Amino acid sequence: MFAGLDLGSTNSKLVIIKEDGSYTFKVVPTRYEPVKAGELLLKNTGEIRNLVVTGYGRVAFNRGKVVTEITCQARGCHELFPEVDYILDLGGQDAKIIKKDGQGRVVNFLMNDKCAAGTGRFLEIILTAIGDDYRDEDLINEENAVPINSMCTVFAESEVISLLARGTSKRAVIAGLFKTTAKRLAKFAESLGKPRKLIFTGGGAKYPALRLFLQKEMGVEVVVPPEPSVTAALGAALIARET
């Protein structure tokens, strides 16, 4: 009866909290149509007492109370990790580092610059194209991960083309892509202060090689929600309950 709806650039997520405190979640692709995805998500749900909508599609949805994904992500990660002060959210279009206090309140945040947009969607695109059917154990076991340009997805695509055109191993390229992404994310995740411990969430945290490369670059403990896709929507549902 308390719903949180996260209409992201790539996927839309619905979390519903029952009176008992338990919760369920639903995830569907956004398909560049946030309104339709959210309506598909909310049908057959039963009647909802309060809704909070977040994500790129939040305004167009024209329902419920609108809250940015920065505030929602902080609220949802605090429910799961009240003792960790820093959150890294990698989505399909934006990357976010958030600092929160003991009560879950955002005390500082930063999002990617313009040239750093779209990293997650690029990784999704390139993995299907290259063909990713080795396990991550192969990727971390790769001794010749190729450094790939960290500037942006344009320069990185140009290098992937050059590398594969020359006959470089797809595993060396894929390993290099995760490794360079992890290196950039580690420096980004220290923007608000050097964390002693880091929460890594968003669909980006579902890549096993990226989690491991990130933890190695960070040099500190990393924790990942049970379901990183939905922690922002859970935060919205907790806000919906509290208000």
Query: Which residues carry a binding-site annotation for [4Fe-4S] cluster?
Result: 115, 152
Q: Taking a C-beta distance cutoff of 8 angstroms, is the pair 176, 164 a contact?
A: no
124 contributes a contact to ligand ANP by CB under 6 A: yes
Q: Which amino acid is at 48?
A: I
d(CA 42, CA 201): 24
Phi-psi region of 146 (alpha: psi -120 to 50; beta: other; left: phi over 0): beta
Residues 132-161 close enough to bind another protein by CB under 8 A: 146-151, 155, 158-159, 161
| Binding annotation | 10-11, 13, 92, 115, 120, 124, 152, 203, 207
Burial class (CB in 10 A: 0-12, 13-18, 19+), 222: buried
Q: Give me the residues that bind ligand SF4 (CB under 6 A), please.
A: 115, 151-152, 154-155
User: Are the beta carbons of 196 and 81 closer than 8 angstroms?
Assistant: no
Count CB atoms within 10 A of the CB of residue 60.
13
Tell me which of 170, 183, 216, 241 binds a second copy, using CB under 8 A: 170
Nearer to ligand ANP, 1 or 149 (CB): 149
What is the C-alpha separation between 51 and 58, in angstroms, rounded? 11
Residue (of 98, 125, 97) closest to 185 by Cα position: 97
Which residue positions form the known binding site for ADP? 10-11, 13, 92, 120, 124, 203, 207
| Cβ(141)–Cβ(169) below 8 Å | no
The item of a second copy, ligand ANP, ligand SF4, none sharing an interface with residue 206, based on CB under 5 to 8 Å by kind, is: ligand ANP
Which residue has its beta carbon closest to ligand ANP? 203
Q: Report helix, strand and coil shares of the chain as percent, to nearest 5.
A: 45, 20, 35
CA angle centred on 70, ends 67 and 75, rounded to 5°: 80
Q: Which position among 229, 233, 235, 240 is part of the footprint of ligand ANP (CB under 6 A)?
A: 229
Query: Which window, 68-76, 102-110, 154-162, 210-218, contacts a second copy (CB under 8 A)?
Result: 154-162
Residue with tokens 């968003």: 202
Chain breaks in the chain (C to N over 2.5 A) after: none
Mark residues 77-116: x for contact with ligand ANP by CB under 6 A, - for none.
--------------xxxx----------------------
Task: Confirm or reject binding of residue 89 to another protein (CB under 8 A).
Answer: no
Residue 120 contacts a second copy per CB under 8 A: no
Q: Which residues bind Mg ion (CB under 5 A)?
A: 8, 91
Q: Is 206 in the site for a second copy (CB under 8 A)?
A: no
Footprint on this chain of another protein (rule: CB under 8 A) = 56, 59, 67-71, 94, 106-111, 113-117, 146-151, 155, 158-159, 161-163, 165-166, 183-184, 187, 190-191
* Contact positions vs ligand ANP (CB under 6 A): 8-11, 55-56, 91-94, 120-121, 123-124, 202-204, 206-207, 229
